[PDB]
Amino acid sequence: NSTVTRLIYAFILLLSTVVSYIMQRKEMETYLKKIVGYKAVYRISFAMAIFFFVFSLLMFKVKTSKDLRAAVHNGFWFFKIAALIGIMVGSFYIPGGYFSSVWFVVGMIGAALFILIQLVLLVDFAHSWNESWVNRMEEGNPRLWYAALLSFTSAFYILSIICVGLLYTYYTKPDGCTENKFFISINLILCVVASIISIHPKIQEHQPRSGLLQSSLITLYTMYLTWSAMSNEPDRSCNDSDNFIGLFVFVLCLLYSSIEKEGVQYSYSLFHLMLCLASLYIMMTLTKWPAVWVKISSSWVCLLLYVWTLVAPLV
Amino acid sequence: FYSRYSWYGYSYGWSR
């Protein structure tokens, strides 16, 4: 039932995200003006953030379902929704202007933190996947699981190669957009290096089940990040599918996170904190130099974190 | 078992 509750919370966030997306359209500018699109998106994102932060602080140090607060987490969906609407209306009551830039910087920091946390989660998920499938390779029919592992890793690497091809075709020119070339070349070379480090026998000796699969997954995620950094480039010479793909990967990570008297399966407080950071990140994404530099540094932090998770046992 | 440094990790399934 706890997993069901986590999935339902993810569902409410997804519904709010879809609402934010739809108001982003030009047609809705007519309706909202009657009370721009980015302003309403900021308002709804602030509602998400404040609600989730409030619930997480409420859920502090809860350790058993015997807590009435555990029931509050489980039930009262209707009161949750009503309080959310009341908050969202309240957001409209805050004056515009300086609040816009304040929330923009708050959203930048939130998106950075969410990217970091989601990335740690992604590395953990990839490691668990690789270990489970190598174990099933050992115990059960070796051929089936070997074929599955090879197909998955090859698929991820081929998709990353296709993304590289598209980015070279679109965001680079023979004698132009040198920033695009720099970013793409650095990301590709560092991804190759990360793959190599994932095979070095000394590294595996300390992490026996660290293999190419998680490397390819990280490479695909890095390719997506770097692409996204380019699509927002203000310079049109160096400049929705990328954001849709990012939303898909975020949904996958949220589902992984989602998937009692003596102990709780997960800290509701920390889960809701992650949810709030997810709201901030989506708010940043759906929409400037900080976006570009944040995304590029996020890709580089991706590769650094993966390399660190692989190497730290060496130290 | 003859565990070996295979690409998919450090295992012995291929050489049990």
Numbering used by the authors:
A (entry chain A): 34 to 68, 93 to 296, 334 to 353, 397 to 424, 439 to 466
B (entry chain L): 102 to 117
Sentences from the paper on this structure:
The host proteins SERINC3 and SERINC5 are HIV-1 restriction factors that reduce infectivity when incorporated into the viral envelope. The HIV-1 accessory protein Nef abrogates incorporation of SERINCs via binding to intracellular loop 4 (ICL4). Here, we determine cryoEM maps of full-length human SERINC3 and an ICL4 deletion construct, which reveal that hSERINC3 is comprised of two α-helical bundles connected by a ~ 40-residue, highly tilted, “crossmember” helix. Thus, we conclude that hSERINC3 is a non-ATP-dependent, nonspecific lipid transporter for PC, PE, and PS.
We tested a variety of recombinant systems, and the protein yield was highest for human SERINC3 expressed in Sf9 insect cells. Formation of a complex with a synthetic Fab enabled the determination of a map of the 50 kDa, full-length, wild-type (WT) hSERINC3 monomer by the use of cryoEM and single-particle image analysis. The average resolution of the WT hSERINC3 map was 4.2 Å. The structure of WT hSERINC3 is comprised of two α-helical bundles connected by a ~40-residue, highly-tilted, “crossmember” α-helix (H4). The Fab-proximal bundle contains H5, 6, 7, and 10, and the distal bundle contains H1, 2, 3, and 9. The two bundles are connected by a long 40-residue, diagonal “crossmember” α-helix (H4). The map in the region of the Fab-distal α-helical bundle (H1,2,3,9) has a lower resolution (~4.4 Å) due to conformational variability between the domains. Interestingly, the density for the H8 helix was ill-defined in the WT hSERINC3 cryoEM map, whereas H8 was well-defined in the ΔICL4 map and in TMS1d17 (d asterisk). The hSERINC3 maps recapitulate the high-resolution cryoEM structure of a hexameric assembly of a Drosophila SERINC ortholog (TMS1d). The cryoEM maps of hSERINC3 show that the helical bundles may move as rigid bodies with a pivot point in the center of the crossmember helix H4.
